[PDB]
């Protein structure tokens, strides 16, 4: 029903993540970011911005608003959006896993398309493609295909 084995990736408690996280370096984040009180406070503002009434074109606006309101460097916000295929829903999932596991980008997270994931999609190898679809699903698979034949 309303159950998914993907919940474990969104279910991360921000109160268990010490602020600022060791992975949150100055080359990815702005001085404002380091002035949030908790990981929860940052997460809550991230959700606030992400939940704006943006039209699919306004990717440039969102990247600016993430920079001004949450202190995420513009280049890093763009990189994240690209590997997320534009899906704003998986934006908080990125940061939760990036901070918890102390890895940028999170390697094995559904919806977070690594470089090696794209190399597997580029190859017509049905073994690599079975591993990919078992990670992101046919939904994200057809979205990534649609995304790159248009790239």
């Amino acid at each position: 029903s309303d159950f998914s084995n993907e919940d474990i990736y969104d279910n991360i408690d921000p109160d268990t993540i010490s602020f600022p996280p060791k992975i949150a370096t100055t080359d990815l984040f702005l001085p404002l970011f380091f002035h949030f009180g908790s990981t929860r406070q940052f997460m809550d503002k991230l959700h606030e911005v992400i939940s704006g009434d943006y039209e699919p074109s306004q990717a440039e606006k969102l990247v600016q608003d993430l920079c001004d309101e949450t202190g995420i460097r513009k280049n890093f916000s763009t990189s994240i959006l690209t590997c997320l295929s534009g899906d704003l829903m998986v934006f908080p999932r990125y940061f939760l896993n990036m901070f918890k596991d102390n890895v940028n980008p999170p390697p094995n997270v559904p919806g977070i398309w690594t470089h090696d994931d794209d190399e597997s999609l580029k190859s017509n190898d049905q073994e690599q493609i079975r591993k990919l679809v078992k990670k992101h699903g046919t939904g994200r698979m057809e979205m990534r295909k649609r995304f790159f034949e248009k790239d």
């Binding site: 943006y54 039209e55 306004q58 440039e60 690209t82 534009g86 790239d151």
Partner: peptide, 13 residues
């Protein structure tokens, strides 16, 4: 501007 105009957002319900 190049990657951002080409990129499409998937907003929240």
């Amino acid at each position: 501007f190049t990657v951002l105009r080409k990129l499409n957002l998937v907003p929240i319900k």
